Each structure stands twice: as C-alpha cells, then as structure tokens.
Symmetry: D2
Subunit: 245 residues, 4 copies
C-alpha cells in the first residue's frame, strides 16, 4: 500500500513518516510539508494519505485527495458540521473513496470518551480539564470539546451542574461547552493529556488519559490506514474500527 504524509515535517507528521517508513506492509510514497506540490502525491501513485497539518489547509488538501480518489486518514483538528458536510458533500460525487477523520488516534483517548458517555448520567457534576504542550494553537482541544459534547448529550433531560458561583474573575470557570465546563492547560513538558471529572455526594470518578509521547498516535493511525477502504465514505472517530477487536 502506497502511503503519503501531509505535514511531514510537523511534530506529529514526522513521527508518522518514520512509522510508515518502518512498516513492512506500507510504502512511503510521498512526504509533503508546507510549500510542496500536491501532485507529488499523484506523482508517486499514492493510494492513501495521512494528514496532520493545519485547520487552514486541511479542506484544501481534502478536495484534492477526494478529487483524485486518494483515501485520507485525517488527524488535523478544527473540523465542523459544515466542514463535515462539505466533506460529506464532496465525497458524494466520489464513491469508493474513503475519508477517516478522528479527533484523537490514541486508544486511551477513544476509550475515555466511551467511558465518559457511560458515566455521565450517574453524576451530578461533570467538568473537563485538558492539558497540552505550549505550542498548541487551539484551546480547548478538539478531543476535550467533543468529550464535553458527549457528556452533555448523554445527560439530556437532567439538570445542569450545580454551581453557586456569585463572584469570579473572568475565565476562572473555564469555557462553556454545551454546559460542561472545559479548562485548558498549556504547559512546557506536556504532550497531550485529559481528565474527565464526575462528582456526586461524597465521591468522584476521574478518567485520565495521558499521551506521554506522540508515538501513542501511530497504532491508531496505521490501523485506520490499513482498513481505510473497508468503510467507503466518511468515518469519524476510531470507535468503528475498535468495537470489533
């Protein structure tokens, strides 16, 4: 299988390049970063692309890829409904082309979101603390926001988090994501971390995920790269490839 990487010089992208290069069943056929022509892709007869670039360019790369029938495994963040729709649109005229977009490729993260969904209804309180390296441009993380969305949707019909806050400094209570507070920590020394906190009378549940290293994202990505053509169209999240094995 001929695999190309968009964002090859990036913190994550370079890690994927080594991963592909080292995979016995994959041929690294393209290494693009900022300012490299996309035809390098079509030129090396790339079959699938791993994209870890930027919210400002991903839709550009996606149109090209789908246009040329190249499958895409996308980790780049910032996707929205309209974006998904756009993708969803684009892919309609391009059947047999698969695009997989995951807010996080680490298994612990995927499991965390799963568990949070399950625990949400049993508690009175839920907040999300997210912790990342100081080079991350967006806060809160997409993973954190998506996790707040899931908790909120799972608690439909229940009252809101109890909060007697009457005076506070702006921002102390974090960002409101569908009524779930989300706090973003940007600290040197960190990579990617998230804590989901549930509380009720006299007890709390914490689901914590820690990416100590960017290699943590490779198994998930390569798993997707390999079974990409199984589900043609648009897949979101890794869950579909996991709640099997």
């Amino acid at each position: 299988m001929r695999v190309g990487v968009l964002g090859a010089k990036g913190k994550v992208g370079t890690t994927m390049v080594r991963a592909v290069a080292a995979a016995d069943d994959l041929t690294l056929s393209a290494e693009l970063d900022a300012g490299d022509p996309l035809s390098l892709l079509t030129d090396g007869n790339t079959e699938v692309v791993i994209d870890f670039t930027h919210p400002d360019v991903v839709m550009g790369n996606l149109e090209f890829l789908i246009d040329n029938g190249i499958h895409a495994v996308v980790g780049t963040t910032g996707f929205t409904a309209e974006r998904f729709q756009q993708v969803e649109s684009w892919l309609v005229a391009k059947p047999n082309t698969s695009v997989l977009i995951a807010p996080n490729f680490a298994i612990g993260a995927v499991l965390s979101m799963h568990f949070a969904k399950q625990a949400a209804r049993f508690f009175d309180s839920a907040e999300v603390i997210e912790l990342h390296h100081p080079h991350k441009a967006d806060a809160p993380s997409g993973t954190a926001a998506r996790t707040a969305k899931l908790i909120a949707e799972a608690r439909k019909g229940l009252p809101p988090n109890p909060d007697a806050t009457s005076t506070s400094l702006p921002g102390a209570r974090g960002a409101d994501v569908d009524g779930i507070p989300v706090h973003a920590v940007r600290l040197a020394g960190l990579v990617a971390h998230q804590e989901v906190l549930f509380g009720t009378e006299g007890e709390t549940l914490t689901i914590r995920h820690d990416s100590l290293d960017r290699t943590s994202f490779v198994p998930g990505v390569l798993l997707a790269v390999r079974r990409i053509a199984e589900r043609p169209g648009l897949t979101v999240g890794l869950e579909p490839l996991l709640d099997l094995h």
Copy 2:
C-alpha cells in the same frame, strides 16, 4: 419499610442510621452494634437489614436473618466463594428471602470496575493502587482485589504484564492478585480511593475513584434496600440494579 442496621455505631453504620432515619419511606426499626441481641431485629418487626459490621460476625448475622426471613443488604467485606455458598444453601430453605452483598456501594466504584473490564484487553500493563484511611483492617481492599480479578479474567489468553524487575525489596512490587499487582496505601486523611492504571506504548489510561466521604455509600445502599425483594435469593454486586455490569 422497616429497616434495621447492624454495626450502628460504626464509621459507616452510623451514617446509614442517619440516612434511614431521614428517609421518608423508611422506618428505622433497629440499631444493633456489638453486644446487642439480634432479637431486637425480630422484636421490632424489621423487614430488611443493612449490615456494615465485621468479617468475623457477618456470617453469624446472616444465618439469623435468613433464618427469620429478614432481607439483607450487606456491605461488610471478606466474603469468599465458600461463604457465598452457605448463604445460598441457607436461602434455598428460605426462598423469598433476598440477600445483596456488594464489595462497594459507591457508584463511581461500580462504574470503575465496569470500565476496567472494558479497557483491560487494550493494554499491555494493568496495576491497581488502592488508598484508604489508617483504620482499615484488610489490605488490599475487597474492591481492589475484585477489580484485579476482573482485569485478569478479561485478559485471559493474553501475555502477562511485562516486568524486567531483577532485584527488589520485598513488597515493593505489591500483592499479586491473579497476576495483577495491587498496592495498598493507608494514610491519615483518606477515606476510600482507588486508581486503575493501564499502560501501553507511549500512553496510559487511569480510572480513579474517590470517596471523599462515607455518605457516598448511602444512595447505593438505599437503592438496594428499596428494591431488595425484586430478586429472591442471593445477589452479589450492585451491577444487577444499576442495569449494567
């Protein structure tokens, strides 16, 4: 519903007394502690008993209760397979009597055991750190041991935790519970806490439960007290009620 409490003066037992006393749909009909006659139960027309006493006396109280058709919600620890056995044969002669024994009545704890079951097969490593107040007689906790049992059974067919330990002080690596290391911390200021740690390449998943207070055990207990007669015979665990596992 007439509810009696065994271990009424205990750290947990007294909390249950207040809880029952305050429940609008329950009548506190008995308060027994060490040295109180069991007939105080039968004497007050008790229908259900909450037992938070001691491993050395629970079987004694259980025989009496079943004998007199009183239902039992038991939180007292130290139950074993053989123990689970006597209570059954005791009930067969007293069908229509229900006994519920739960290693933990806090919801977060029950959910933690559920999640650990689900995550076990996705990681190379699993260890359990358990933390309790310095008055706890047994280590590791029953909750921790049961959680190690579940993780082990969920990983049947997979290799053991990788460990290159070649020299160590005795005990440094914790207790072996079905091949899952369990560490017991006994510290002033704590109540009841447990951490489940899963690890694989470059990432870890931690499910942490904290009982900051003994009130955390009341909802679970009262839930069981109320639906006790829904299942005649023995019920081990709170799972069946929480409609999950």
Copy 3:
C-alpha cells in the same frame, strides 16, 4: 480563654463551634450567625472571635471587634489591600488587639504555597488548578489567587509562560492572575482542593493539596486562637506560627 464564633451555623462555622466546645482549654462563649446581635459577644465577655462568615459582613464585624478590643482569627475570604489597610488603619488606634487573617488554615495549603514559592524559578511554566464544592461563591479561590501572586513575584525578571494559543473558546485558558493562569473547578463531592503545576523540558512538578474534610481547618484555627495575643496587630497567613515548630 473565652472564644466566640461568627458564622456559627455555616458549613465551616459549625465545625469550629464543635471544635471550641470540645477544647478543654477554651470556653465557647458566643455563637452568632446572620441576625444575631454582636453584643452577644461583649455580653459573654468574649476574648477572641473566630470569623467564618462572608466578604460582605466581615469588615462590619471587624470594626466592632477591634473597637471592643476582642481579638479576631479570620478565615472569611475576599480581603484586599484597601481592606487590609482599613484593618491596618483601625488596628492602629487599637493597640494590644490582634487580628489574624489567613487565606487558608489547612497546613498542607500553607505548605503548598511555601513550596510553590521555592519551585517557581526553576520552571518555564506554572499554572494553578483549584477544585471546590459547588456552593462556593467566589472563583478563583483566595488561596489559588494568592498562590498565583506568589509564583509571579518569585519569577520576577523571568519571561512569561510560553503559550502558542492562537484560537480558543473564551475562558478555556482560565483566569489571568498576574500572568499565571488559574482554573476553577466547581464539582459536587469536593470540599477544597488545589494543584500547582510546574513544567519544563520533559518533566513536571505538581504540588497537590486536598481538604477531604472541613475538620482539616481546625488545628490551624485553634493554633491561631491560642497564640493570637503573641503578635498584636495584623498577621496574614499561618506561616508565622509554623516556621518555628
């Protein structure tokens, strides 16, 4: 020693009442809550008062107390420079009257602030996560804000926390306290908790303090109540009574 309590029916105040009542060397001589006359104090010949009330009334109570020469141990939050000054003022015409105001009376909290002061200069990043029960009116806590102040002052002359945040939801990055981000979590089941996070290349230092119970504030308070008259005037913080024994 005749001790009176302001805020006697409060979450913390009631705990202090039991504490005083149980102290063999203290006489509980007054129990005031909202709507009780202050002369109850002067009426019972109170010598020292413990105040755990509200930012809106503390200055009122303080004027009376100082006016009548009653010493005050104040845990109520929301004090400011002008307030301190005001107190500082007031106390000038009232020598031999001592007032002790502490942002936190738990020893671990006092130690945490001490340690943070010491570690601040060794790291590139510092953030503060504070976690409290959902009845707390103010965010961030006074302890958290004071801790951010100390870290900032200890890092004078060093560059700011590195942060590449370019897009973010409002509040995701917390409150800015002297350039130190502070995040406030309000969750059911919690009492009073704080985490100080320091980060540099490939490592982090976390100093975590947990008040699992409001009794945690009693030793500190009673220590202050007893040695109150040692330092006449205004003392802030418990440190002066600790960096001895």
Copy 4:
C-alpha cells in the same frame, strides 16, 4: 571542554550524546557502550565523562576515570555507602579529580526531595509511590528509596505511620524503607514518575514529579558537567549546585 559518554547506546545515554553533540561549548570526544575500550576516553583527550550505564560496571569505569584524572558525572544507580567509600579513597590519591553522583538529574525530582524533607514533620503519615517504564531492573527506584530515607530522618523522634493492618496479601503494603512504605509501579508508556503522600486528619499533601521524557535529565547533567571542577573530590547529589538542599 572534552566530554565523553559511557552508555552511549542506552535509553538515557544516547540522549546525552545528542545533548553534548549539540552543546556549543562542549566537544563530544568519546562514545563508549558495552564492549568499547576505555582507552577511547584517554585516547580522545576526554576531560569529563557522563556515565549512564549499569550498577555492575560503574565502579569499574569509576576506578579507571579517577585513575586517569578524568572527572565523572554519574547518573547510573545502585551506589551504596561502601561504594561511596571506594571512590573517595580513590580520589584522595588523585585530588583535583571531581566525581558527581546524583540519584536523579531532573530538577523537579531534586525539588521534590527537598520539599518532602520540609513537610515530613507536619504529618502523621508518609508513603512513596514510584512509577517507571517496564525496562527498569531495580525496584524501588533509587530516587524513591533516597526520598524515603530523607522523610524517615526528618521524622526522627516522632511515632511511626499509624497502620491497623491485620491481614494482608504479601507485598500489598509495599517495601519498607526505614519505616516508610514504598510502592513500585512498572507500566508500559511511563518514563519516570514519583508521588510523595503525606496525610494527617482530614487532609493530604502530594508532591508529584513526572519525567515525561528523558530530555528532562539533560539540563541537570550538563549543569554538572560544566561546573564539575568547582568541587574536587566527591559530590553526591545535585543539591550543592542548585544552591539549596
């Protein structure tokens, strides 16, 4: 300054090689791993050596180095009183040779040991949880053991940790280090982590250090490499350099 590295191919050693190579004021003059002659050191005019090898070979390398007047910055673990002894008598015959041995070169770790020293006397309980990658041969870590030693010495004259344990699985309570329990976790995905837990009535203090990456040990090592000759003879610990203790 001509710097050589012993254990150049090791997890940590290779990281030091890159660090030296990249330092503008240091010349990488030697790269030895298992089976490389020590004369490669003397051969390249090496002035200082960084040793991250193995307890079984460090004394061998130390004799050679001191013998030839090469300074040594040693991170390799397993040093003991008797060991500390040979190196001294070796140096007496080679004054002007400096040897620095540190159980940990990460700053957060050094600070953690400092703080634990300070907090020890204020609590009733102290335990140490240490967490490392599954390739570590020794448990508990030297850092953890040294930290338990310090806490114990700081609590001389005080009673022991209160523990009502009466029945337990072997090892559940950890290793005894001078009466301080130490627990060693070996988990995939981890690098080097330690938690110090102090507890007293209703509260706990936790000092947590996390090395998410082996780069975390470079600043400390290079700092020592550079000022090595400031102190002829033996220096145990990084404390003397950090101007603290």
